[PDB]
Amino acid sequence: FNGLTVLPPLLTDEMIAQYTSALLAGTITSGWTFG
Amino acid sequence: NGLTGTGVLTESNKKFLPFQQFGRDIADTTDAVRDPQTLEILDITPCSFG
Amino acid sequence: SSTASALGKLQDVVNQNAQALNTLVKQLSSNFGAISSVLNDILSRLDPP
């Protein structure tokens, strides 16, 4: 801490995991149609 | 004792070896001191900003 | 699980950023030709002009 700061990312890790889970479920149930 | 700086001081649980006077961690920034009267280790943190 | 050093790229990015910050903050202790590297001392030890 000498005048320098670190800002947190807007998306937390839980949300990123949720996106990955949604993508995986979509591709595992609907094929490529959901794209 | 001649070492000057601004911040907020709290109690600390570090254990100085009986001859050091202060401490630094990385890039040579002082973090702890020893008051020459009570002979206890105090911890320094910068005043808040943003 | 077993083999290590499989994630070299992300570790490299982190190390590069940390090293850049470290060298930047360490550069604060150089005279650059002046008489001292601390500003309070030169304030309190010498004539303003």
Ligand SMILES: *[C@@H]1O[C@H](CO)[C@@H](O[C@@H]2O[C@H](CO)[C@@H](O)[C@H](O)[C@H]2NC(C)=O)[C@H](O)[C@H]1NC(C)=O
């Ligand atoms: C510095 O001198 C002061 C003046 O007496 C000491 O303060 C007292 O010291 C006695 C003996 O250790 C303690 O029982 C008291 O509680 C102290 N009073 C305080 C701190 O208000 C002090 O101990 C001396 N410093 C050192 C390192 O010996």
